[PDB]
Amino acid sequence: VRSIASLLLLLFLFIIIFSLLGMQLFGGKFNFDEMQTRRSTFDNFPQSLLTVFQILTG
Amino acid sequence: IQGAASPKDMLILVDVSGSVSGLTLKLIRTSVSEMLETLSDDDFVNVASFNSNAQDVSCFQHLVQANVRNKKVLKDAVNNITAKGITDYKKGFSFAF
Amino acid sequence: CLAMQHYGQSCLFKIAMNILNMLFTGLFTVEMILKLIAFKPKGYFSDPWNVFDFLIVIGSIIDVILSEVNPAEHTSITFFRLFRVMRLVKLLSRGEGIRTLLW
Amino acid sequence: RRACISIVEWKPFEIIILLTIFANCVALAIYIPFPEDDSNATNSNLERVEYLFLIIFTVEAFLKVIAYGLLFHPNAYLRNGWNLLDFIIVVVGLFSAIFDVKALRAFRVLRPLRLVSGVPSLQVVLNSIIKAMVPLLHIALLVLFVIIIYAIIGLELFMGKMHKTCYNQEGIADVPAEDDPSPCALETGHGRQCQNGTVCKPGWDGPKHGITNFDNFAFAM
Numbered sequence A: 001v002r003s004i005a006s007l008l009l010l011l012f013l014f015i016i017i018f019s020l021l022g023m024q025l026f027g028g029k030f031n032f033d034e035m036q037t038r039r040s041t042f043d044n045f046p047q048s049l050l051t052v053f054q055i056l057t058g
Numbered sequence B: 001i002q003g004a005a006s007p008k009d010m011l012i013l014v015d016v017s018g019s020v021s022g023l024t025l026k027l028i029r030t031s032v033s034e035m036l037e038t039l040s041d042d043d044f045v046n047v048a049s050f051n052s053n054a055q056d057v058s059c060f061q062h063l064v065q066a067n068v069r070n071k072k073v074l075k076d077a078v079n080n081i082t083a084k085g086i087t088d089y090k091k092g093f094s095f096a097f
Numbered sequence C: 001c002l003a004m005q006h007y008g009q010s011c012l013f014k015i016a017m018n019i020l021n022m023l024f025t026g027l028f029t030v031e032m033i034l035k036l037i038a039f040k041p042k043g044y045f046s047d048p049w050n051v052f053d054f055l056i057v058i059g060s061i062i063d064v065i066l067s068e069v070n071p072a073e074h075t076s077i078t079f080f081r082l083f084r085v086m087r088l089v090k091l092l093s094r095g096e097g098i099r100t101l102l103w
Numbered sequence D: 001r002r003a004c005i006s007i008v009e010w011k012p013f014e015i016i017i018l019l020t021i022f023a024n025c026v027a028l029a030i031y032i033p034f035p036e037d038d039s040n041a042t043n044s045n046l047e048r049v050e051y052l053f054l055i056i057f058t059v060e061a062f063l064k065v066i067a068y069g070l071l072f073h074p075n076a077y078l079r080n081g082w083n084l085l086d087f088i089i090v091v092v093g094l095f096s097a098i099f100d101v102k103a104l105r106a107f108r109v110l111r112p113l114r115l116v117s118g119v120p121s122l123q124v125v126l127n128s129i130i131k132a133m134v135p136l137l138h139i140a141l142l143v144l145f146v147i148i149i150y151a152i153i154g155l156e157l158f159m160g161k162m163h164k165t166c167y168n169q170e171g172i173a174d175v176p177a178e179d180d181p182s183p184c185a186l187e188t189g190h191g192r193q194c195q196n197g198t199v200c201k202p203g204w205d206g207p208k209h210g211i212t213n214f215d216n217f218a219f220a221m
């Protein structure tokens, strides 16, 4: 466990970084005239995490 | 409408701020149009908009009787609008009142 | 040169690419002829890689010869064109770690 | 005099510095990126909090450069810290002065990467992870070459053949007839054909937004 928590903490930190970067890049720029089916968006941090997680699993 | 309500003096404070850019702006414009569709000829209207400054989308600057014609100007102005700036309810409402 | 071409290409650009195509197939034919003079066909076919080179160059020249006619105008079979790119695989052989891993 | 600053590092303020890094990491999830220049109240106080973080980080950089010297400090994992301070200074100055000035705000998302460095208990696991990366480089080059070969082959074969889609034959309005534009090819070219009441003619109906076709070489890759 004490060794497991390190790896998972590192991965959690990486996801936070690549979500906080997406916020500053695509933050609220997913507003298109088309119907807003863009559920997997970068708007707010709690959902940037879900989008980054979705990308990771691909 | 002539029966369900007395005349009105509307003042639509369309919120053209950055937070509405996209689909929501289209909904706002369509809704404003479908609302001006519900004004008779004996009840006035105007369309302000606030983005830290309460401009007027039209050339009127006061209430304009919502004829069949002034409605056209207001609808065209609404259609030709774009989001920007920072939302500021206090200024917009002060201008409206 | 292969990767350069793109949609909406200019006729002059197409001509230049055809020129470079002929030039490169000529250089590789020089490769082949120099190798043959270096040692005879029996030794030339010793390793498949040179045998692999055999079909590419002939196919490329077949492509160029086929290009002499003009089915299209700068105003059909399209199989032998891929040998030029497939010749890139030779570059993968230079690396030894990758060679051993794949083998 | 330099010793007085240096002996401060003996006093464990690195704990408060890492708590400050964590505070800044928190102070970035709350920052909502409104679409077009909009900003609620919180976004208007996070600039002040960012100024505070700037000051504390630059004070720490000054202390750890004066106590450890100009030449030696870059020769360490601290390479990023000074880099972050430089870009954050430039960003704040340019933003106050006023263009790419705003977009440059993204360089602060590296500060969480300072957290892992601060806790050397994790640098070991980072080194473990990157250590296993080196063997893959052979697979990296193999996949790169496969990508290049197949992209070039795609350029040779599907050379922008996905730009013709089925259009309405009435002709009043010229919009992709099918709600899902599916590249069709007119007869004399093997492929599908329009339904009984539409015609497949050139244009750029193409694939989704014209982002996945084989036109260029970058598009192929």
Ligand SMILES: CCCCCCCCCCCCCCCC
Binding pocket: C016, C019
């Ligand atoms: C109008 C003729 C266009 C040029 C075609 C000639 C073939 C050579 C390309 C031009 C020179 C650039 C350098 C070629 C590589 C040495």
Ligand SMILES: CCCCCCCCCCCCCCCC
Binding pocket: C076, C077, C078, C079, C082, D153
């Ligand atoms: C339009 C003429 C008929 C089709 C011509 C292409 C046939 C071969 C396609 C596949 C070739 C690439 C093989 C994969 C790479 C080694």
Ligand SMILES: CCCCCCCCCCCCCCCC
Binding pocket: C089, C099, C102, C103, D146, D149
């Ligand atoms: C005689 C020594 C052979 C050394 C290994 C060469 C491997 C070549 C094939 C690699 C797998 C296919 C990749 C490209 C497919 C289009």
Ligand SMILES: CCCCCCCCCCCCCCCC
Binding pocket: D022, D023, D026, D027, D041, D042, D045, D049
């Ligand atoms: C490590 C514990 C503290 C983490 C939070 C520090 C920053 C909080 C200040 C900003 C909070 C919003 C206040 C804006 C005024 C309504």
Ligand SMILES: *[C@@H]1O[C@H](CO)[C@@H](O)[C@H](O)[C@H]1NC(C)=O
Binding pocket: B080, B081
């Ligand atoms: C829209 O309004 C703006 C106001 O700046 C004006 O410049 C422009 O000509 C108008 N365009 C249309 C489509 O009416």
